[PDB]
């Protein structure tokens, strides 16, 4: 989980990085006991009992989303960000964690580091990175000539300033999911 809190610049929602977790001793006790984390919801089973559970593989994603959009990520639930950027599959047996970083990601003079996907033709697949800067959000006219009207760059700027409120403030977020078809371990 060292990379989970050691990335100075988190991945933007459209470009969500994927990391692989395996062959190690899990510390969900660290997750719900650290007490610095702002949010902790694990849909698959009660988070405390998860330490006993053993799985073949683990998958994790780190991205920064606004406080307003944190509610959007859920299995069977979405939002404008979830529909075109990142969303949760109907069966998720892991957890969703959020930690606010007001000082780290709200620099003075504007933040050009983070941008968010705004337009897609249809709902994207869960766990799908449409990182490609595909344009052509128009239809009647080819987008090649100009962004005259419907045509637009589907990537938009999420500028940040210290005055931004909690919903405006960037909240770092991670998601966890497991499957067995090598990750667990009792101790004491």
């Amino acid at each position, epitope marked *: 989980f060292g990379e989970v809190f050691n990335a100075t610049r988190f991945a933007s929602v459209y470009a969500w990085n994927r990391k692989r977790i395996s062959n190690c001793v899990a510390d969900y006790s660290v997750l719900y006991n650290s007490a610095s984390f702002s949010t902790f919801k694990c849909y698959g089973v009660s988070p405390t009992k998860l330490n006993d559970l053993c799985f073949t593989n683990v998958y994790a994603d780190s991205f920064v989303i606004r406080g307003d959009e944190v509610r959007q990520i859920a299995p069977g639930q979405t939002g404008k960000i979830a529909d075109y950027n990142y969303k949760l599959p109907d069966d998720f047996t892991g957890c969703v964690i959020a930690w606010n970083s007001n000082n780290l990601d709200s620099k003075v003079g504007g933040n*050009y580091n983070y941008l968010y996907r705004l337009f897609r033709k249809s709902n994207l697949k869960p766990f799908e990175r449409d990182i490609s800067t595909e344009i052509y959000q128009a239809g009647s006219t080819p987008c090649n000539g100009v*962004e005259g*009207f*419907n045509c637009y760059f589907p990537l938009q700027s999420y500028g940040f300033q210290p005055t931004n409120g909690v919903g405006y403030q960037p909240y770092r977020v991670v998601v966890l999911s497991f499957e067995l078809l090598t990750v667990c371990g009792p101790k004491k």
Partner: antibody
Amino acid sequence: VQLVESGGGLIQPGGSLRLSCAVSGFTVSRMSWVRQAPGKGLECVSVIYTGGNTDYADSVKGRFTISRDNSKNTLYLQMNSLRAEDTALYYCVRGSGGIHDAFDIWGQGTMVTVSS
Amino acid sequence: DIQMTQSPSSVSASVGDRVTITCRASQGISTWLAWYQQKPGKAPKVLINAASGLQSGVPSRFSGSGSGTDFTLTISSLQPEDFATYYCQQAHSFPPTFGPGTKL
């Protein structure tokens, strides 16, 4: 939030006028120019895009230079080919937005007269 | 420019009643209109999100369906803020062109 402009005034025809408007509350992205005739309805005309693509209506096609400054957040418009049809209230609005061509955050603008 | 007409071209004082805004297609406009509210001495603002796909970020009082030649919308009730000049804009193609407009 509030876009501020200067240089809107009566001028003799041919004079070169630079119109400056200030982006407020957001990182510089898009600016559009819309003109309203005094005691008459407004009419959309010249626009610029964040992509650097440019659209000018037949009223200002090839006659208006539209630009913004990322460093100073000051929008640059240079008056060229002064004509009776274009002169009137001038407004700097967001260039485009929404699902389709939507401008929402506006400023006071600079009403412009032309005469002797 | 574009050729369309907006009604009611003339508006008498509207008291305790629904107000209707209408315009007619020139480019086969479908869900391509943005409604406007303006106060004199102030910058004009959109009265709706234009509902190109769905109406949003607007009080439900102004709701209408624009497609084909029908671009009509209704206002729930008269208000001091609702006492406001209204206009329409061409949306599908360049240049966007404003409809005649009406004031209260």
